[PDB]
Design an enzyme around this catalytic site. Structure first.
Site, PDB file in Angstrom:
ATOM      1  N   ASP A 187      42.773  50.494  42.090  1.00 52.34           N
ATOM      2  CA  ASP A 187      43.241  50.045  43.329  1.00 52.34           C
ATOM      3  C   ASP A 187      43.729  51.660  43.921  1.00 52.34           C
ATOM      4  OD1 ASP A 187      43.954  48.189  45.320  1.00 52.34           O
ATOM      5  OD2 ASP A 187      45.760  47.985  44.832  1.00 52.34           O
ATOM      6  N   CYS A 221      36.769  43.249  46.612  1.00 51.25           N
ATOM      7  CA  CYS A 221      37.782  44.003  45.813  1.00 51.25           C
ATOM      8  C   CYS A 221      39.121  43.229  45.987  1.00 51.25           C
ATOM      9  CB  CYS A 221      37.916  45.357  46.247  1.00 51.25           C
ATOM     10  SG  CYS A 221      38.027  45.790  48.161  1.00 51.25           S
ATOM     11  N   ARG A 227      37.934  49.971  48.433  1.00 51.21           N
ATOM     12  CA  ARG A 227      36.691  49.813  47.489  1.00 51.21           C
ATOM     13  C   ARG A 227      35.353  49.236  48.143  1.00 51.21           C
ATOM     14  NH1 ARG A 227      40.277  47.846  42.168  1.00 51.21           N
ATOM     15  NH2 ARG A 227      41.352  46.875  43.978  1.00 51.21           N
ATOM     16  N   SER A 228      35.500  48.064  48.818  1.00 49.10           N
ATOM     17  CA  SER A 228      34.379  47.541  49.400  1.00 49.10           C
ATOM     18  C   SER A 228      33.772  48.418  50.356  1.00 49.10           C
ATOM     19  CB  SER A 228      34.762  46.182  49.973  1.00 49.10           C
ATOM     20  OG  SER A 228      35.056  45.158  48.906  1.00 49.10           O
ATOM     21  N   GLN A 265      40.355  53.695  52.487  1.00 49.31           N
ATOM     22  CA  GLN A 265      41.904  53.474  52.705  1.00 49.31           C
ATOM     23  C   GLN A 265      42.717  55.041  52.007  1.00 49.31           C
ATOM     24  OE1 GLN A 265      44.575  50.760  53.274  1.00 49.31           O
ATOM     25  NE2 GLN A 265      42.835  50.641  54.855  1.00 49.31           N
TER      26      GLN A 265
HETATM   27  C1  LIG Z   1      52.377  48.134  53.811  1.00 46.99           C
HETATM   28  C2  LIG Z   1      52.291  46.660  53.246  1.00 46.99           C
HETATM   29  C3  LIG Z   1      53.574  45.712  53.516  1.00 46.99           C
HETATM   30  C4  LIG Z   1      50.801  46.050  53.504  1.00 46.99           C
HETATM   31  C5  LIG Z   1      50.504  45.001  52.509  1.00 46.99           C
HETATM   32  N1  LIG Z   1      49.364  45.297  51.922  1.00 46.99           N
HETATM   33  C6  LIG Z   1      47.988  45.530  52.278  1.00 46.99           C
HETATM   34  C7  LIG Z   1      47.537  45.738  50.955  1.00 46.99           C
HETATM   35  C8  LIG Z   1      46.603  46.113  50.199  1.00 46.99           C
HETATM   36  C9  LIG Z   1      45.364  47.102  51.133  1.00 46.99           C
HETATM   37  C10 LIG Z   1      44.357  47.688  50.328  1.00 46.99           C
HETATM   38  O1  LIG Z   1      43.558  47.974  51.141  1.00 46.99           O
HETATM   39  C11 LIG Z   1      44.080  47.185  49.311  1.00 46.99           C
HETATM   40  N2  LIG Z   1      43.121  47.785  48.475  1.00 46.99           N
HETATM   41  C12 LIG Z   1      43.108  49.263  48.107  1.00 46.99           C
HETATM   42  C13 LIG Z   1      41.635  49.636  47.570  1.00 46.99           C
HETATM   43  O2  LIG Z   1      41.188  50.875  46.952  1.00 46.99           O
HETATM   44  N3  LIG Z   1      40.695  48.449  47.678  1.00 46.99           N
HETATM   45  S1  LIG Z   1      41.676  47.175  48.324  1.00 46.99           S
HETATM   46  O3  LIG Z   1      41.516  45.942  47.287  1.00 46.99           O
HETATM   47  O4  LIG Z   1      41.167  46.938  49.871  1.00 46.99           O
HETATM   48  C14 LIG Z   1      45.088  46.454  48.405  1.00 46.99           C
HETATM   49  F1  LIG Z   1      44.873  46.300  46.982  1.00 46.99           F
HETATM   50  C15 LIG Z   1      46.161  45.923  48.981  1.00 46.99           C
HETATM   51  C16 LIG Z   1      49.077  45.445  50.511  1.00 46.99           C
END
Ligand SMILES: CC(C)CCN1CC(c2cc(O)c(N3CC(=O)NS3(=O)=O)c(F)c2)C1
Length: 299
Positions: A187, A221, A227-228, A265
């Site tokens: 992640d 993901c 990752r996607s 990200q």
């Molecule tokens: C500021 C916070 C209060 C916001 C709340 N959030 C959004 C979250 C989030 C965003 C992500 O982008 C990802 N990923 C990271 C990647 O490398 N592939 S993902 O599965 O997309 C994730 F695991 C979790 C958590």
């Protein structure tokens, strides 16, 4: 045309970003130039238990709709790039109560493959529900009328392939679904090597699942963006260079972000993309004698 090799423009930009240590400033430009678009349906009160993360939503103009259901909503987006004849659905890892909607989508859209890039548990937190069976028991989704059965399992060092039988109880039909699971991508992290990621993408392509004669493949993901987004950007860019387009990676990523928010990200995820696109371009085969000589001299 120009004097460089097919990947020369991208490779020189990569070296310049490294020498001037400019990966973080470029990542910031991309964030600042990404426009926002309406996402009202995602925020209806009746959909609050259908979203994994409050800060990650599909846009109204590109969301995937469920057919013949009282509530048509799922946190999923259609990313279609007709310049490359490629269509994808990017989605969150389903919750216990949205696994039934996820398989209804797979059936209605005529998908052949699911590409999964996360583990079920990461850093002691659940990231996705167990939406396929691990033994010989049938797994039933009674809200939408589907059942799933494990047919085959092939385990390698850094990824696994499951073949699944998906049964539509209401129509009396079944389909074989290919489930491609990358098990070693953390992640907010990067894969083990360009070579590791590229061997995996070539297996997905060899099955025919990305070809325009099937429905769009489902990529996911945990949130469906970091990752996607990395996987989809690398695949799309390789198709465009194969057909001969002179591409600008920043421009292609901004265009794909018009279909789903936040793809890629971290600055290191952006740098890994450039490396995989350069190394992959050297693997493509074709009929050009000039291109084949470049490949031999760069190996
Ligand atoms: C500021 C916070 C209060 C916001 C709340 N959030 C959004 C979250 C989030 C965003 C992500 O982008 C990802 N990923 C990271 C990647 O490398 N592939 S993902 O599965 O997309 C994730 F695991 C979790 C958590």
């Amino acid at each position: 045309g120009p004097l460089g090799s097919p990947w020369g423009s991208i490779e020189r930009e990569f070296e310049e970003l490294d020498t001037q240590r400019r990966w973080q400033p470029l990542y910031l430009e991309i964030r600042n130039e990404s426009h926002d678009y309406p996402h009202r349906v995602a925020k209806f009160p009746e959909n609050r238990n259908r979203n994994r993360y409050r800060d990650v939503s599909p846009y109204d103009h590109s969301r995937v709709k469920l057919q013949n259901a009282e509530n048509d909503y799922i946190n999923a987006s259609l990313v279609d790039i007709e310049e490359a004849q490629r269509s994808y659905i990017l989605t969150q890892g389903p919750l216990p109560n949205t696994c039934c909607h996820f398989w209804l989508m797979v059936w209605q859209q005529k998908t052949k493959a699911v590409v999964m890039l996360n583990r079920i548990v990461e850093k002691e937190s659940v990231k996705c529900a167990q939406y396929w069976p691990t033994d010989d028991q049938e797994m039933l989704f009674k809200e939408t009328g589907f059942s799933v059965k494990l047919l085959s399992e092939d385990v390698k060092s850094y990824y696994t392939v499951h073949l699944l039988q998906l049964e539509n109880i209401n129509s009396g039909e079944t389909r074989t679904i290919s489930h491609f699971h990358y098990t070693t991508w953390p992640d907010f992290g990067v894969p083990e090597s360009p070579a590791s990621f590229l061997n995996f993408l070539f297996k997905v392509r060899e099955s025919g699942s990305l070809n325009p004669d099937h429905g769009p493949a489902v990529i996911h993901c945990s949130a469906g963006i970091g990752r996607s987004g990395t996987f989809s950007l690398v695949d799309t860019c390789l198709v465009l260079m194969e057909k001969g387009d002179d591409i600008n990676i920043k421009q292609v990523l901004l265009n794909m972000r018009k279909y789903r928010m936040g793809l890629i990200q971290t600055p290191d995820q952006l740098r890994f993309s450039y490396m995989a696109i350069i190394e992959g371009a050297k693997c493509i085969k074709g009929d050009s004698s000039i291109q084949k000589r470049w490949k031999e001299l760069s190996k």
